[PDB]
Design an enzyme around this catalytic site. Structure first.
Site, short mmCIF file in Angstrom:
data_model
loop_
_atom_site.label_atom_id
_atom_site.label_comp_id
_atom_site.label_asym_id
_atom_site.label_seq_id
_atom_site.Cartn_x
_atom_site.Cartn_y
_atom_site.Cartn_z
CB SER A 161 -18.15 7.64 9.70
OG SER A 161 -19.15 7.03 10.06
CD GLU A 220 -5.92 -0.31 -8.84
OE1 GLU A 220 -5.01 0.16 -8.58
OE2 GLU A 220 -7.28 -0.02 -9.06
CG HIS A 232 -1.99 1.22 1.06
ND1 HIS A 232 -2.94 1.41 0.57
CD2 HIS A 232 -1.76 2.39 1.95
CE1 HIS A 232 -3.61 2.23 0.67
NE2 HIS A 232 -2.86 3.25 1.55
CB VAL A 292 -6.47 -0.64 7.93
CG1 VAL A 292 -7.60 -0.51 6.91
CG2 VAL A 292 -4.94 -0.85 7.46
CB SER A 352 -2.94 7.11 10.30
OG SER A 352 -4.26 6.90 10.91
#
Ligand SMILES: NC(=O)c1csc([C@@H]2O[C@H](COP(=O)(O)CP(=O)(O)OC[C@H]3O[C@@H](n4cnc5c(N)ncnc54)[C@H](O)[C@@H]3O)[C@@H](O)[C@H]2O)n1
Ligand SMILES: NC(=O)c1csc([C@@H]2O[C@H](COP(=O)(O)CP(=O)(O)OC[C@H]3O[C@@H](n4cnc5c(N)ncnc54)[C@H](O)[C@@H]3O)[C@@H](O)[C@H]2O)n1
Ligand SMILES: Nc1ncnc2c1ncn2[C@@H]1O[C@H](COP(=O)(O)O)[C@@H](O)[C@H]1O
Ligand SMILES: Nc1ncnc2c1ncn2[C@@H]1O[C@H](COP(=O)(O)O)[C@@H](O)[C@H]1O
Ligand SMILES: C[C@H]1O[C@@H](c2nc(C(N)=O)cs2)[C@H](O)[C@@H]1O
Ligand SMILES: C[C@H]1O[C@@H](c2nc(C(N)=O)cs2)[C@H](O)[C@@H]1O
Lengths: 195, 205, 205, 195
Positions: free
Chosen positions: A60, A148, A41, A56, A50
């Site tokens: 929302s 991908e 990634h 991961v 993060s």
């Protein structure tokens, strides 16, 4: 999941404290607990931070978007395509980070492959037929065209993500990844499963 | 989604809304096909139930998430353990916890209680590394009472799938014991547990 | 009779003859109506199986009869533990053990292993009298491994009803582990265990 | 099951070491483990010894006899009817022993009552209709006409049997039991359940 050593971190200078030797230990721990590497990634510095330390997590927003998922690629050259999207920095763009993504070996039968092009209307009915339920992806992943992979968010959120040892170039900046910069120790750890 | 089909679920004192034994059987089979295996029950108060189910399990030497293979042990925790914000103590819910089948080699078992002096070294011996638990789990006797409790290390607990149980809690007997006759046979039939290792892990094949 | 209807049963390496899940369900329901409750499995070699089933369980501080609520623990004993008279080590059988529901107040549970130094006084404290066990039973962790084993005192063990199980032992894997997928769901569904007391017995009502 | 004291034994002299005080303790232990008194069994000295120390065991003969079971009676006067069958002893007959018979309180729903006379042909179809299966009795018992009870052997063999405190008389010898010889401490322990 990072192995023994000092606090790991991301910089244009490079992922601080991350050696291919440290990668090797961490990979082995993961394999002993049944996790498998499924791809890379590529993303920007603070997104890497993060994901690697926070996990991961999906947004929302756009909950019913048909093609939502976490994108990864078997090929680091492909993933290398990604880094800073924040073009201002003054018109500036930083180099980001490449990460390795692992899933439980038992989730592999939910991984599908199609020759159709992903996130294109036509590919929709085909994928819903592969996956066994209406889109979006849940505990599944789909591979299709260079190749991908998208992981349904429920799967993406349960993955283990650790840094890659293949570094990013600032005098380059997202694109033609230098094949000679991929450590071979890592090259021998980066084989993908069949789907 | 992990709850199958039939409308949205909700936790209430009268029982989990829109959840049935039939809908549990479906969700169960869907989880099995995606490689998940049931490893125990987790009992909690109404609000923790809704959060865990629609938000996920989320986080000391012994830190981790507790579950019980025996529905009866998890049942004693399925209620408020002190009056809530409105001064109520009410019945809670039982949740079913699932983990990837490929994680099973990280689950061990001991005859020692985790309060026992030799427990820390015995656990680090089976697990193969210093505490706290990572992608591992230990099942052993509860400190007082003999029933077996399982602690999943936090890294592992946050990667489980949790769905509601069809075993109801009784609002006319808050704090009461689990009447085994109220466990639907369709659910008992789908709750066998995996054998956990009693010997340290051999290097993987 | 306790074996229901369908011809005579026999224990063989290929499996228990004339015994089916359907015939187990019948015998089970007949036992329940006569007030018996299932409390565990007992695993043994072919000849002890036939004897116990058609002859009955029949007889130290810790003397008594061992059973396990977890079919997997009883499975490891379901085979010959040394070569028999003809030099064979072969698979055995799993038996289901029943006791009167009214005997349940004599069953207790402890977190201690019965090899533990304080175990004898802890047991005599719950049981209310000096060892050996009489019309009582204790369930606790096995000495090494964590699974729970139950010892029924001899007076109680000789008053049980034992019928065969429908869980088969594998003749191609003698000494192997129990594949939980070989346990018929109809049988898992009828094997919930009673909650045993963790506190001494209060004088009867 | 005998309580604390010296080794118990049977003699025409009387059950050695058996006091109504010892009876009381033993009865209480039994009740704490869910056993209930269902009646008396009168028999000869060495049969009592076999039952109390060896256990109620059926014969391997007459396995299909319709009315086979272990006979007991709520009324000790009835059971008192039994002692030595071995008439020779010289034409002599000894006094035997009265015993108390207990079953699990949970077996009580398999206990039936009929007004028909037991072990009579006519009573057969009725009892098979009460009991739920063809005779013989298994885990059941049947009460019928003075009242006597038969326990199916599978039930009889799982009972707990202890001595009674009501003694046998040699100057009597099976028959008119002296009501004044039944201890009242025991009389208050000898109530039967309903069927
Ligand atoms: N409750 C059980 O199922 C269970 C089985 S064994 C057992 C016992 O509990 C003892 C420990 O209790 P404790 O109170 O210290 C445990 P802890 O302090 O971790 O309890 C956390 C509470 O918050 C709840 N919670 C709410 N939302 C979440 C969420 N999103 N993710 C995770 N948890 C959430 C938990 O279910 C629980 O009710 C153990 O030693 C063990 O003996 N509990
Ligand atoms: N076998 C199990 O189901 C089981 C569950 S736990 C367990 C373990 O076994 C250990 C003790 O083993 P051990 O060899 O000393 C026990 P023990 O010496 O009492 O074994 C007796 C053997 O003879 C058999 N037998 C044959 N006929 C009869 C009969 N008619 N009535 C009763 N038994 C009969 C028994 O099943 C058993 O195989 C325990 O400490 C416990 O950890 N065994
Ligand atoms: N915690 C995170 N989990 C998943 N993606 C993240 C996270 N933080 C940043 N990102 C990045 O945001 C993009 C994915 O989110 P979305 O726009 O919802 O597909 C990618 O660039 C991810 O690398
Ligand atoms: N171990 C025993 N169990 C049952 N009855 C016995 C036993 N030993 C002697 N008896 C006596 O034998 C008669 C019952 O056996 P049966 O002739 O088969 O009914 C009664 O007198 C019993 O009191
Ligand atoms: C979220 C976006 O990321 C793309 C991809 N990103 C990667 C990566 N970041 O490594 C591989 S494919 C998808 O095509 C979407 O445009
Ligand atoms: C076995 C015999 O005992 C009779 C009975 N015996 C008793 C007893 N022994 O107390 C009560 S009824 C039955 O009628 C049979 O004749």
């Amino acid at each position: 999941f990072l192995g023994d050593g000092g606090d790991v971190s991301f910089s244009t200078r490079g992922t601080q404290n991350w050696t291919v030797e440290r990668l090797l230990q961490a990979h082995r721990q993961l394999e002993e607990r049944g996790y498998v590497f499924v791809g890379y990634h590529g993303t920007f510095l603070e997104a890497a931070q993060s994901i690697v330390f926070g996990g991961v997590r999906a947004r929302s927003q756009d909950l019913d978007a048909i093609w939502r998922g976490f994108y990864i690629a078997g090929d680091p050259a492909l993933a290398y395509g990604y880094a800073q999207d924040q073009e201002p920095d003054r018109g500036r763009i930083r180099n980001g980070a490449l990460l390795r993504v692992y899933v439980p070996r038992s989730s592999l039968p939910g991984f599908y492959r199609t020759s159709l092009t992903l996130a294109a209307p036509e590919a929709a009915g085909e994928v819903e037929r592969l996956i066994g339920h209406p889109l979006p992806l849940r505990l599944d992943a789909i591979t299709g065209p260079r190749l991908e992979t998208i992981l349904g968010w429920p799967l993406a959120e349960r993955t283990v993500v650790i840094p890659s040892a293949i570094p990013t170039d600032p005098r380059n900046v997202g694109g033609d990844l230098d094949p000679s910069s991929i450590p071979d120790k890592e090259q021998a750890i980066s084989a993908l499963p069949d789907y």
